[PDB]
Amino acid sequence: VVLQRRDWENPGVTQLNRLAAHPPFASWRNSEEARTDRPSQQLRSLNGEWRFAWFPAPEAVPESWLECDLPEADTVVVPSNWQMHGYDAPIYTNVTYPITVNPPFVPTENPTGCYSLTFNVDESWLQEGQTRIIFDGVNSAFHLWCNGRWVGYGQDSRLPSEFDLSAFLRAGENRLAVMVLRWSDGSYLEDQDMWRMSGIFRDVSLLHKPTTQISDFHVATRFNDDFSRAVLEAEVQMCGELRDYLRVTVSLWQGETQVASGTAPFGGEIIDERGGYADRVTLRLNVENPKLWSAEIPNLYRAVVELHTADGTLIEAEACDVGFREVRIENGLLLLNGKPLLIRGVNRHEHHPLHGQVMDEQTMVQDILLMKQNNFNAVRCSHYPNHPLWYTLCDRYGLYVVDEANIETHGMVPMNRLTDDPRWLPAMSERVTRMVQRDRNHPSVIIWSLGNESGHGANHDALYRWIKSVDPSRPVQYEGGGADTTATDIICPMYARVDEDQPFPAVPKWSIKKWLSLPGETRPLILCEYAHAMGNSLGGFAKYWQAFRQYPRLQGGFVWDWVDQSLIKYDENGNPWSAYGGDFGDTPNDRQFCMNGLVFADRTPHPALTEAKHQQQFFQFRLSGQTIEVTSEYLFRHSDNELLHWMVALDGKPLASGEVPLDVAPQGKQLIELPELPQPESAGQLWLTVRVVQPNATAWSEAGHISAWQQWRLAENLSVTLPAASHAIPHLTTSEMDFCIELGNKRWQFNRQSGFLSQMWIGDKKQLLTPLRDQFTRAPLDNDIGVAEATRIDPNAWVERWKAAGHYQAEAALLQCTADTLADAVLITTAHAWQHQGKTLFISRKTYRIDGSGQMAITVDVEVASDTPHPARIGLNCQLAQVAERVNWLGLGPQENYPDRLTAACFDRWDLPLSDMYTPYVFPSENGLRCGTRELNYGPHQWRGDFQFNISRYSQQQLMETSHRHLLHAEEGTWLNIDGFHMGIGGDDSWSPSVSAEFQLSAGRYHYQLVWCQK
Amino acid sequence: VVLQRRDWENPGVTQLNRLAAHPPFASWRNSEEARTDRPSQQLRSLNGEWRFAWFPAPEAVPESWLECDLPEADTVVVPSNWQMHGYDAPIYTNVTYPITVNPPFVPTENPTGCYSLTFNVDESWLQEGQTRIIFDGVNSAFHLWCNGRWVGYGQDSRLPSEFDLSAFLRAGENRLAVMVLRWSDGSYLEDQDMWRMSGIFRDVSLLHKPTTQISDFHVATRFNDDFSRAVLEAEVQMCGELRDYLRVTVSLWQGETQVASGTAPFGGEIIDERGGYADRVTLRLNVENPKLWSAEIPNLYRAVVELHTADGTLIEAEACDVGFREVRIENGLLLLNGKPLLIRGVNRHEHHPLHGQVMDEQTMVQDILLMKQNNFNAVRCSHYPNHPLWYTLCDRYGLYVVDEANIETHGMVPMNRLTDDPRWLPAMSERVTRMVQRDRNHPSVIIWSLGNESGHGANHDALYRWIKSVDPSRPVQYEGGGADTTATDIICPMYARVDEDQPFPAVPKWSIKKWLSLPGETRPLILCEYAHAMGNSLGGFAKYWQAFRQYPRLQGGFVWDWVDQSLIKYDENGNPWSAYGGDFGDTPNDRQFCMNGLVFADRTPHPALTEAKHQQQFFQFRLSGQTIEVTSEYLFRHSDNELLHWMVALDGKPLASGEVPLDVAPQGKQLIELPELPQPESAGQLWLTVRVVQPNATAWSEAGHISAWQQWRLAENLSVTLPAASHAIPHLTTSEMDFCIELGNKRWQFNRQSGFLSQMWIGDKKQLLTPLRDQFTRAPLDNDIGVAEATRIDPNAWVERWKAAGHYQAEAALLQCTADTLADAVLITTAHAWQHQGKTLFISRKTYRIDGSGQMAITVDVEVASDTPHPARIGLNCQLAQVAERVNWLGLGPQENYPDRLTAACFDRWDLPLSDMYTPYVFPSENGLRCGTRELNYGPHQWRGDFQFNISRYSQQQLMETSHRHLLHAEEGTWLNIDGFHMGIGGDDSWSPSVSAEFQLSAGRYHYQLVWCQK
């Protein structure tokens, strides 16, 4: 029947013999074990070594496999994705389906994973009760056999499939055979923008329940007006034979203290003309002054559900963590415990560079700690229900969760083709309903989502209403079909900009500020995805947060996204390197578009993370006179683990510093009066830096963790004192080919043919490897490239405009090169035109003034043709001979910062190793810039002015020519790019120009000045 | 795979390889044929003689049957139910499922119908295009084979199942094999209160569509504020390969005049980020001053949908009737074309006494004609989608239709066990979605219903919203779970009473007047079921209509129900008789509860129909002096086929009459001045009767049809004249056992032992067969019995209270019997007590005064113990020796009428054959009463007074002892029951006391007087 029915090409069959979904069960037979959440003897993990054989299709599976281990099969670890063991290739595609679009059919060549396990079941489980097997995750569809007999079938890669094995198991040795199909009709609802893998990728377990058993339970908590009183309402459902002596006790615990308890026999209230549920009971417990759950303070109680007898004999016990919180939208605002939330969220896929889509505790805990340490309080499960442990950790560490149905049909044309089709309603309904049935008791889940990128169809409205009817405690959201449809309680757009409208037909992305106030619109706005963090990105992040803080109904959003989906590959020498789309022979693919994270795949932070941390701070600061006003954006907690450090520095030189304890109520303010500052006579800018430090360790952070910061300029004393007049005068030497200047052991050489400083000598040592030349281009960022699909070529993308205009191939034509001797200096005057096909793109006019003190003052005035696309940068570059270990600068740092991503950086004296001045983006691009720099030091060299710079062993040319970071080779010496001006990086999205007008280099005329000297 | 999978015990499989649902198709290849709705050569009927074999289970079907006929099978007509051919028994159960409640499982003994057909398929049908088979109704599940090969499977008994046979057929002879299962998992959703049958009971046909085809189309009509302008919007979908030369033309016709036309290529507007529907097109046609559709004037247009090439080759045409109307709920009122409807509705099952649940055009038309002739304007499809032709006939004749999904789970405990279960949402969703997809273009359908008696579950809420999303043009209603849930636009209770609350826990039935004004309630109220017409019923019908006319938001209801579900059986002599539950060996069963109709199964009216007709009249009347005020309750039409006839009579004797044409605007009034009526000389009451007559035939009625009537009392002249004094004196003779009175040829005999008139002589011929005795009981009506289930005994039911009180077995005890000779009379005085086990129930005190003119004046004074249940009647009865041909009376008539059902009856002189004075209710009961009678004539006898009477060949005793009307035998002579007082019949429902307090005999003391004489 299996090969004949083809259940995997029929959306009307999504399972056979599958048990009903439910909340996490462990079937404890001891109440104390249930209370403490300790292991249950009745719940057994089947994770470990399994037998596995790969086949190109289900027809290729030999019938002997049903009863006998195949000798060709390998021993593998389970849970696993079989692409990670190398049996076939993982595929990265964004929108376009990995299979031909022909529902409900899949390719006849359908990679098939035959898993099997020989295992022992103890005699006790056979005589009495029910033994079920639970597969927490099988991608994408599977048939199940036990001891050669067919058991059932299951679909939906992201939710547990469970089957009764009581009638299939025997004394001693048993064998399970699992035939997993890569493709099925389920694949049409699984078109998420991520790697396409398959296999038994989440836990496998055996659970033993009595015949008379708790089959479901729901915990609800409702509150009075000031949250001083709560009622915990618990509905408990049973299966098995009903008896008059049966009882349910629900008890609520706070540590070892029982705070409330209720006991009742089965028999619900009358529901209709035919009665009520005899097999159900609802317990109501009163709790006075409950401790409330939030992400700020994740207060939890333990509920223990006991199925027992009247005379006091336990049959079984289940349990859950309970967080007392209320979620409601009121007057246009999303409230938690009566207070408006500000969502500092991030989208997080389930990804590991080694293990694929298999999740483990260590990695999950790592992500949560890093999220909380960087001021995130919310996570969206993009775009499927997660590994069950994720919700436990969110409950316990404290994160708001958007739990999202495993439904995405992005690749359909139009996007709603399936979701508007009633024939696909059954498949869709199960992905929503079984999610709710599983996760409804988790306090961390505050919002339900209907899925992702599936247009808006009538099936969405049906399922929206289903959830609203079944669980009034959580809003339902869904972005598809315009982000403000009838299927959503929350205006939840993706990549809607702050001020700029994007008026796409049918599905516009309005300015978020404008969207709120459209005629008739009353709902809160929280972006489900924003600030697309692909490569060198998060330009304009501060603009979002300013708007979130200003507009009550703008309640934040979820950054896209947490972690790069890069996979580990190995070269000839067995050295690991980060791979993306296409690196596995997978075609078609969408290349580096799988990497959009704030962190690298190994959870090393990208520079963008510190900007996110800074903008998402829970303390806001103002300065007036010497008064710092600290405002708390905590809704619930006081600042009981916070002190304020302050320091004043004169151009990086410390002058005064102190600390003050913070005592701010939620939403409150504290005024801190700075002591009288000893002013300096010497010139320069005084800078005040404040930092909020957590003196004590928490569950999620170390002692001394810095949670917030801010800088202000204080007094400036401008330098008026003349530089000490030098005795020596530099000497000009003229030839046909070169102008040469000499002063002591220093020589400067200007090539009269090129018009550039071609060489510098300190004694007989050459300082340059490539001449000092203007640069107007950058190695293109993912944002400049502006591509979401590898097939899509957009003439409007920045990089395409720069290419089409000749920016990358414009050659410098010399217009003027003259030398003059002054009283105490030599003056070199130059002029250059950059042209492409008879069109002058840029003109640079310079003076180099070399005085008797050995300083070269470079003055640069640039013209940019108003009709050429605005250049990526306006500066100079050269390759220095020197390779030094350290880079020292007075400017914004310490991390990479760009003009539209520099709010997190602070002005100070910074000193890093050279390798830290390069950001290892997996797809190489312009990187490592630091802005607002007044002084840069490298080996013998010092540069002074007001510039942006990067410095590394990689030229812009190499960076733009190399597709992977592991293929980069250090060049001879050091490439310095010093910019007068540099373009924003943008990132509102990465598939259209996203750089805001004010960060584009459109002024037409530009001036900057540098002093180069040897200190 | 078939016997192994058991798809009929799987709610997750409701079909296999079934094609998408759609509006009625005929695939015309000529546009004129499409327009005129003439037969299509591409649509062939497979109705006629098929091959049938019955089997106790599917496992008993011989595998030979697939490829070859079984000679042991019979030739039967299709469509049919196989219970109607004798193969097994039809089962009548109300609530309790006909199978053990063990979802999804059905009994292993699952009766199985093996249908097969051998038929010709022409070559032209297989060379080009697609050949599909359509099963309009198969009860309840089936597998399909074509030429031995398995095609598919389908569930839902009440919607068409369709399969592509293109790859299965050959030129010339082919064979179909259909294995129909009586029970399936679909039976759990098919628990309607009706005969449980099975088989291919609706049409089977073959449809040829071209490869490039119209696969769906939707017609919408929207209007400006005053309906002077309309836009017809038609969405058309195609299958096949898309081509730039393809076009759709939608043309709209009014008779032979084309009114509007639109032509367009395929390609819908942009829908989302992925584009729009390339395979769809929407045509918009402007119509100025559209002729509007309503039940009053069913104006229809013809829409022809042409799929063709740009240069004009027709590929295929589909078509439909279009009715321009708007249905909306505004400010708590249901509006059609801007006007508030008053629903004069009835529930109608698909029932034929000879053919079961097979429907034919003739029966459908008969039903529509009778409905409209009796002032109905609406029908509810209780409780499933109907035969497709019903909707066409409702479109054309003009009836408002509630189209209801085939979902009833009444027998579940609680009622919502399956409807609140997400596992059953897929099966439920198809029963809703496929109905809407089929019927959405029929203008007669004004409201969608989600099913019946399935409680209220989350699945209802989901499917409610689905319909609201897909079709905004029609309100959605559903009664389950209390009639005012979140799943209904209309408060739609069943059997809620007018003034009386029924406060059931969880699902109360409030007084309808009170329900409207409950805090926060704003919706309209229209009863889905009311005035249960079981047997002698519809008491209190006028109370509903009074309330409907007074309260704007009470907008009517649907009577339960149209036609008795009785089936024909044949006796030993081959004579037909009407059978109800239990008469087929079916057990358990609910007996006569299948008969609740206004008409008998052969469409002969019950007496209740005339009461409905009268109360549902469209003209209302008031009298003031000589002025008649006629008010129209038409919303749209003027009274252009109506004349008012009026007549004044003095105690039945005509004195003056006339007629006046009616000219009343919709909702308007007309004043009619009666001419001066000459005074009558003689005594008596003048009566005015008005009738609205339709001079012209219509599509639904004959010339001279009476649509409305009303009566008033005018002047009364009370008789003051003394009856001529006679010179004869009656003579008293006394013995131990008798008082005898003689006058001329007349003799009366009073038995002194019993105290009753035991005999009466005219010309020494005996007039009585049984003495004249008081009667306080009636052969109980179905309403008195008070049973919805044959297992349920209710001590509160009228019959049970009467029985427990000993009313039916109390015997007369003589207290007094005396005789006095007077001047011109003999006076007999009697007194009796009726007692049961020590308790005196009633006392009757009488005088009989026999004077010289031969008249016997009887005066009766009765006492009824205040603590005994109020008696059914207070009167006399006797068995007359005479059988006469005619009954002549001055009173209310001509039809049977009871105190709470006499509004339709008129006071006049009526003359009927004796048989008309008996109503042949299938379950015999008290019947044939006529109220407000002043004079009764039968043979030589005349009774005068003010009484209610019935007269027949059947005693109350025989009536109450006989379970079927065919088992009744005429008794010797004629039983006369003359009542001073008679209890109401009730009928708000038939399973609880429903007689209103004002119609109960609770006064304690009663008085009436009769004069008995010879004329």
Ligand SMILES: [Mg+2]
């Ligand atoms: Mg499937």
Ligand SMILES: [Mg+2]
């Ligand atoms: Mg997508």
Ligand SMILES: [Mg+2]
């Ligand atoms: Mg089934």
Ligand SMILES: [Mg+2]
């Ligand atoms: Mg029912």
Ligand code: NA
């Ligand atoms: Na806000």
Ligand code: NA
């Ligand atoms: Na991506």
Ligand code: NA
């Ligand atoms: Na590159």
Ligand code: NA
């Ligand atoms: Na009304």
Ligand code: NA
């Ligand atoms: Na009934």
Ligand code: NA
């Ligand atoms: Na009877």
